[PDB]
Paper text:
MTMRs are part of a large group of tyrosine/dual-specificity phosphatase superfamily (PTP/DUSP) members in eukaryotes. Typically, the active MTMRs catalyze the dephosphorylation of phosphatidylinositol 3-monophosphate (PI(3)P) and/or phosphatidylinositol 3,5-bisphosphate (PI(3,5)P2) to produce PI and PI(5)P, respectively. Most MTMRs possess Pleckstrin homology (PH)-GRAM and coiled-coil (CC) domains in addition to the phosphatase (PTP) domain, and some MTMRs contain extra domains, such as differentially expressed in normal and neoplastic cells (DENN), PH, and FYVE domains. In this study, we determined the crystal structure of the PH-GRAM and active PTP domains of human [name] and investigated its substrate specificity through enzymatic and mutagenesis assays.
The [name] structure was determined by molecular replacement using the MTMR2 structure as the search model and refined to 2.07 Å resolution. The refined model included four [name] molecules (A, B, C, and D chains), 652 water molecules, and 6 phosphate ions in the asymmetric unit. The refined [name] monomer structure was composed of 14 β-strands (β1−β14) and 17 α-helices (α1−α17) that formed two individual domains: the PH-GRAM domain (residues 98–205) and the PTP domain (residues 226–605). The PH-GRAM domain, which was originally implicated in protein or lipid binding during membrane-associated processes, exhibited a β-sandwich structure formed by seven β-strands (β1−β7) and one α-helix (α1) that was similar to the MTMR2 structure. The residues of the C(X)5R motif in the active site (Cys438 (here, mutated to Ser438 for crystallization), Ser439, Asp440, Gly441, Trp442, Asp443, and Arg444) were aligned in a loop between β14 and α9. In the [name] and MTMR2 structures, the PH-GRAM domain bound tightly to the large and shallow cleft of the PTP domain formed by residues in and around three helices (α6, α13 and α17) and a loop located between α11 and α12. Among them, one phosphate molecule (D3 phosphate site of PI) was positioned in the deep cleft of the active site pocket and was mainly trapped by its interaction with the main chains of the six residues (Ser(Cys)438, Ser439, Gly441, Trp442, Asp443, and Arg444) from the C(X)5R motif. The second phosphate molecule, which is positioned at the D1 site of PI and only found in two [name] molecules (chains A and B) in the asymmetric unit, interacts with the side chains of Asn351, Ser439, and Arg444. The side chains of Asp440 and Asp443 are positioned away from the active site cavity because of the formation of hydrogen bonds with the side chains of Lys285 and Arg484, respectively, creating sufficient space for the phosphate ion or D3 portion of the substrate. The molecular packing of [name] in the crystal did not show any oligomeric association.
Numbering used by the authors: 98 to 139, 144 to 160, 171 to 186, 194 to 605
Write the structure that this text describes.
Amino acid sequence: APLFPGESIKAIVKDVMYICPFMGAVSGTLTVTDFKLYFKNVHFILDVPLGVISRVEKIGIEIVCKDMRNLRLAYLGIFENLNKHAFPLSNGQALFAFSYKEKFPINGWKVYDPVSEYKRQGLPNESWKISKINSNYEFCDTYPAIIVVPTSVKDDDLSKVAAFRAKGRVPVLSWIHPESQATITRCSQPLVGPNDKRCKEDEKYLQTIMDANAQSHKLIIFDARQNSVADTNKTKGGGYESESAYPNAELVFLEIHNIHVMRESLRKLKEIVYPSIDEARWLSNVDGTHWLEYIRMLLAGAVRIADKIESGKTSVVVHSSDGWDRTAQLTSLAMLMLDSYYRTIKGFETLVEKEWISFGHRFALRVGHGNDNHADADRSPIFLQFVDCVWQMTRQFPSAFEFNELFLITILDHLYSCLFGTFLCNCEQQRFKEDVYTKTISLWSYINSQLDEFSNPFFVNYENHVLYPVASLSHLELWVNYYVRWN
């Protein structure tokens, strides 16, 4: 079997039967490495990263995968080896990323530089400064080391605001309009609780964010959640900004459902796409998953944010509960609509590095890297669902993005594979602790060393206006190239 630099064979068993869903059963040799399982017949090639493996179960072995397929095998050896190497963090080993020894002409770790990105946006300026208050992750330990905040806020006041926001995730700048100065700041829910606690500093801080947009007379807060779910959160000590505490602000709910319904949705969708589609009942089954309605809700949400910035010329604040699953989906979809830089390949890479990775989407937890707890309720395809949305925009706007569909699918494949450092861990701090930036390779090193493979030939770089995709089921499609890829 073929091997990456740093990859080692763990087992090679001959005469093993792979069971196609339809085309019977092939004979071949099964190699297990610490990176992948490999199966060859002599041509028939099955090449499957152990990262995509969710659970292994004797039936006679069933391999449940995370990329819309299963595998059936007919035979330490096999079971124990797949288990040991598919789930190394459950077995005192490291993820493969840390052994990968390839060297690329381009270093992906240099693609995103926070200070450069802020500078690309016109920052700092008179109203927004680069703050180092979190340079040791002591201020908010799930936030990146660098944040952008209003010039006028004192560090002591920011700390009070942090005590009033879940996990200390205070409002910080995500994007600023280069003409109006309207901004998208992001945060987590305020800790109001059932007795309507108030924090003068929080109220005052939201007010300074508004005053930084000097022409504007109000501030909009998009709360990603359903009204009912925000109310539940309120009884638990969370909640949202009130009309009376935040006088110059107005809050609206985007009604996006919680991470568990998204997991359940994708689960139902896998049932009907693999091993085969029953086309006689395809229409209702797919409808029954509600997968495309949740896509629509998100795109509709992001358009509202985009429209308010671009047309309304009004600064907005996006928050959810912890401000790192739906918040990250919404700010980055709206930024993508607003700023054509992010529709280039390097721009989209900074967008994922910044809004997703540097701000703490819990990738390790949400995806389950190298951990065997398949039933964990903290796993959810939040990032996948986001990439689907992005794919929706490339399809309504087939010349607007520099990257192509294979770019997006390649990202999803390496979301699971752990070949690269890029989607490792749950927050920036964890990444410095675990030596990710020194012991692992960036996904973008690979992608950007082979740009032609991932480029949209139809791309036109002056399609640089705000894009408002149409959030209607009539204008959306099932991403069959990804979801039905395996048959």
